[PDB]
Amino acid sequence: PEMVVFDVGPRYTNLSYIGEGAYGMVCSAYDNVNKVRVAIKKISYCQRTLREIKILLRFRHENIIGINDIIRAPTIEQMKDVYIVQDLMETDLYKLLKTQHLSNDHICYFLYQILRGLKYIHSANVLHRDLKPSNLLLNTTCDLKICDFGLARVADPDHDHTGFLTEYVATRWYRAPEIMLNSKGYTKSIDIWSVGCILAEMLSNRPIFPGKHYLDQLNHILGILGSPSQEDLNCIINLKARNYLLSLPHKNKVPWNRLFPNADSKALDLLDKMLTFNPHKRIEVEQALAHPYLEQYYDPSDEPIAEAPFKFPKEKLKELIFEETARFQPGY
Numbered sequence: 001p002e003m004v005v006f007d008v009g010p011r012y013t014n015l016s017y018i019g020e021g022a023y024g025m026v027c028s029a030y031d032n033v034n035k036v037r038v039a040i041k042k043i044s045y046c047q048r049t050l051r052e053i054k055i056l057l058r059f060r061h062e063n064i065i066g067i068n069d070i071i072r073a074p075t076i077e078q079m080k081d082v083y084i085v086q087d088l089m090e091t092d093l094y095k096l097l098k099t100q101h102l103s104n105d106h107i108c109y110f111l112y113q114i115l116r117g118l119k120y121i122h123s124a125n126v127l128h129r130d131l132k133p134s135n136l137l138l139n140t141t142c143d144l145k146i147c148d149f150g151l152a153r154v155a156d157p158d159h160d161h162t163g164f165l166t167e168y169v170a171t172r173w174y175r176a177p178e179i180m181l182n183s184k185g186y187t188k189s190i191d192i193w194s195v196g197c198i199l200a201e202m203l204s205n206r207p208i209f210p211g212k213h214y215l216d217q218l219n220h221i222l223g224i225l226g227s228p229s230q231e232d233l234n235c236i237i238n239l240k241a242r243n244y245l246l247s248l249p250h251k252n253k254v255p256w257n258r259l260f261p262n263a264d265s266k267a268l269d270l271l272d273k274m275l276t277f278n279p280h281k282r283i284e285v286e287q288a289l290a291h292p293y294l295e296q297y298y299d300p301s302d303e304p305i306a307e308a309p310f311k312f313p314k315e316k317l318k319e320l321i322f323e324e325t326a327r328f329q330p331g332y
C-alpha cells in the first residue's frame with residue numbers, strides 16, 4: 001500500500017500531498033493508464049460524501065468537475081476507505097485571487113463559466129449552496145469547473161421559510177442576507193448571491209462582505225447596499241426578522257463605482273442585479289447569462305441544461321456508498 005496510507009493500487013503512483021479536504025486527504029498522483037497527473041481524495045461527514053458522489057456521477061458538464069474513477073475494497077466487509085479520482089487542476093480562484101490581479105477579460109470569462117455551470121446545476125433542480133472562490137477550479141488555460149457539492153440540495157422554495165437567526169452551514173462570507181433573516185437557503189436565489197460576492201471579489205482581490213460572525217455578515221451587507229426599502233421589508237413576514245431590521249440605524253447605499261473605481265460599468269450593473277437584497281427581485285441565472293456584460297460569450301444553444309431533474313443508520317449509509325461506487329470496480 002502506497003503511503004503519504006493512500007493505497008490507490010498500482011494504476012496511481014508518485015503521490016504528492018495537495019491539502020486536506022472535508023472527509024480526508026487530497027493528493028496528486030500519476031495515472032499510469034492516461035499518462036497524466038490526477039487529483040485523488042481519500043475518504044475515511046458521511047452523508048455529504050454520498051450526496052456529492054451521487055450528484056457528480058449524474059452531472060455531465062464542461063464547467064462542473066467530474067469523477068474519473070472511484071477506488072474501494074471489492075466487498076462491504078473489507079471497505080474502509082474510498083478514493084475519488086479527478087483531473088488535476090492547476091489552481092483554484094481562491095489561490096489565484098491571493099496573488100494575481102485579474103484583467104477585465106479574465107473576470108468576464110470566469111463569470112461566464114460560473115453562470116454556465118450554475119445554469120445546468122439549477123436546470124437539474126439542484127442548489128450548490130457553497131459557491132466561493134476555493135470551490136472553483138482552474139486549469140492552465142483558465143477553463144473553470146465548479147466543485148464541492150457537499151452542501152448541495154434539491155430546490156424547495158415552498159419550504160424555505162424559517163425564524164430569525166436560524167443556524168446555517170454554508171461559508172459565512174458568501175451567505176445571502178435572507179439566510180440570517182427568514183430563509184433556509186432552499187431557493188435558487190441563494191446561489192446567485194454567492195456568484196455576486198465572487199464577482200465583487202474578482203474586481204478587488206478581497207471578499208466584499210467579510211463578516212466575523214453570523215449577524216456581522218448582515219451588517220457588512222447593509223453597510224454597502226444601505227437600509228432595505230419599505231417594500232423589501234414588507235416581503236419579510238417574520239416579525240422578529242423584520243423588527244431587527246427596523247431597529248438598525250439608517251445606512252446609506254455605497255455606490256458600486258465608488259467601491260470598484262476601475263471596474264467595467266456593465267460588470268457593475270450585473271453585480272448590482274446579483275447583490276439585490278430582495279431575493280425575489282434578484283436576477284436569475286439565465287438573465288445573468290443574457291446580461292450585456294457577457295455578450296461576447298452568450299450562446300444559449302451552447303449552454304446545456306440537464307436531461308432530468310435530480311432527486312434523492314451508519315450501516316445503510318456505508319451500503320449506499322458501496323452501491324453508488326460499484327460501476328468503477330475492475331470486474332467489468
Ligand SMILES: O=C(c1cc(-c2[nH]ncc2-c2cc(Cl)cc(Cl)c2)c[nH]1)N1CCOCC1
Nearest residue numbers: 021039040041084085086088089090091092
Ligand atoms: O486539483 C486540485 C484539487 C483539489 C481538490 C479538492 N480539494 N478539496 C477536496 C478535493 C477533492 C478532490 C477529489 Cl479528487 C475529489 C473530491 Cl470529491 C474532492 C480537487 N481538485 N487542486 C487544488 C487547487 O489548486 C491545485 C489543484
